[PDB]
């Protein structure tokens, strides 16, 4: 693809997401860089409202798969990079088990040679001393297969899959992930065969850093496809 030309170094990475979950407002800025090359994403998370009033886990997969590593003999399957630099709509429903559900509705696309992801995120149907809003999860992160398929009608693609976020008990917080890709420009996008993503994320934290906050290594590479 023309776009996927523009992944081939190190790109910046802004993140600005809105939020209201059960009437929680709340706002995150992000930035970092990601380097399609390795499948690598380098980013910090800053609540700018105060306190997150979810907690920081849930909101990974809504924080930019057009740095996920296609192998070459995958390219043809990258919708992602595809679609840029014009960008893509993302939504997703992301339902907690027993619990609520966020929607999301995202734009990722260049601003300059900067890639942006700008979300919505609405949560409803929160239990008030659940897992999400009473804070019972765990400050780390699994490993995914994200499932890919084409959505022919709506010129882009759908995905679903399954995260799991470890709870202090030691149990599972199920987060059932459908997702949309939809692309905004009028360039040739690809549309994909089945395949899937695989995913692996590490959280820290920032020594120096007071406000409420996230700093997220993550690597991605698409699989399930031999030739």
């Not at 850093?209 to 698409?222: C, I, P, S």
Request: glycine share 8%; proline share 4%; hydrophobic share 30%.
């Amino acid at each position: 693809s023309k776009g996927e030309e523009l992944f081939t170094g190190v790109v910046p990475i802004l993140v600005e997401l809105d939020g209201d979950v059960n009437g929680h407002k709340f706002s995150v800025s992000g930035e970092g860089e990601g380097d399609a090359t390795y499948g690598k994403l380098t980013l910090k998370f800053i609540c700018t409202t105060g306190k997150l009033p979810v907690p920081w886990p849930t909101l990974v997969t809504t924080f930019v798969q057009c740095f996920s590593r296609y192998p070459d003999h995958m390219k043809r399957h990258d919708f992602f990079k595809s679609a840029m630099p014009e960008g893509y709509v993302q939504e997703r429903t992301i339902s907690f088990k027993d619990d609520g559900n966020y929607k999301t509705r995202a734009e990722v696309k260049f601003e300059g040679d900067t890639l942006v992801n700008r979300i919505e995120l609405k949560g409803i149907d929160f239990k008030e001393d659940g897992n999400i809003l009473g804070h019972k999860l765990e400050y780390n992160y699994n490993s995914h297969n994200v499932y890919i398929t084409a959505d022919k009608q709506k010129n882009g693609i759908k995905a679903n899959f399954k995260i799991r976020h470890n709870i202090e008990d030691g149990s599972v917080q199920l987060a059932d992930h459908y997702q949309q890709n939809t692309p905004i420009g009028d360039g040739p996008v690809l549309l994909p065969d089945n395949h899937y993503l695989s995913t692996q994320s590490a959280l820290s934290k920032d020594p120096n850093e007071k406000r409420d906050h996230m700093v997220l290594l993550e690597f991605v590479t698409a699989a399930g496809i031999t030739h």
